[PDB]
Amino acid sequence: GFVAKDDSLRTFFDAMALQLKEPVIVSKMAARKKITGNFEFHDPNALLEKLSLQLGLIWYFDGQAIYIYDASEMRNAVVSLRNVSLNEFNNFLKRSGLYNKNYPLRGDNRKGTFYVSGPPVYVDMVVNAATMMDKQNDGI
């Protein structure tokens, strides 16, 4: 528990992380925001979702660490996907547990690209995954 009084987001999320196994990595732009209020950390993921909406943040848990960015650091990507169905690629991300429902792949089965917008660490993964998968399927 924690009563914040104009504390930097970095200090705040460090406080949240005390009761977590994973470190929290707060971007430069997120860290310059301040936060005030009475906080209880009885449900960190729910809090993260709410604060991301209140304060204009985006976040990703990659299974080992939590990344927090300002909404202004959102990466907007267009990604080629020529040799695999969008649905196959989606399921692949999901099964692997890297997919984040807050940052969905936006495409259609007619065209050879899809869009994705979200935390840089996430989008970088999505782009790499699509690039690896497209190549490995580039054949009869």
Residue numbers in the entry: 34 to 173
Show sentences the authors wrote.
The bacterial injectisome, or type III secretion system (T3SS), is a specialized syringe-shaped protein-export system utilized by many pathogenic Gram-negative bacteria for the injection of virulence proteins (effectors) into host cells. The injectisome can be divided into three major regions: the inner- (IM) and outer-membrane (OM) spanning basal body with associated export apparatus and ATPase components, an extracellular needle, and a terminating pore inserted into the host cell membrane called the translocon. The major structural scaffold of the basal body is comprised largely of three proteins that arrange into a series of highly oligomerized, concentric rings: two intimately associated proteins localized to the IM - PrgK/EscJ/MxiJ and PrgH/EscD/MxiG, and a third protein belonging to the secretin family of OM proteins, InvG/EscC/MxiD (Salmonella enterica serovar Typhimurium SPI-1, Enteropathogenic Escherichia coli (EPEC) LEE and Shigella dysenteriae nomenclature, respectively). In summary, we report the crystal structures for the cytoplasmic and periplasmic domains of PrgH and InvG, two of the main basal body components of the prototypical Salmonella SPI-1 injectisome.
Similarly, a dimer formed by a unit cell translation from the InvG crystal lattice superposes with a dimer from the modelled 15-mer ring. This would be consistent with a model whereby the soluble domains have low-affinity interaction surfaces for oligomerization, which can be captured by the high concentration in the crystallization experiment. Mutation to alanine of the strictly conserved Asp95 within the loop (which lacks any direct interactions with the neighbouring protomer) has no effect on secretion. Furthermore, we observed a positively charged interior collar of the InvG ring corresponding to the N0 domain, where residues are proposed to be in contact with the inner rod and socket. This surface is formed by a set of basic residues lying on one side of the InvG monomer. In particular, we have previously shown that mutation of Lys67 abrogates secretion by altering substrate switching.
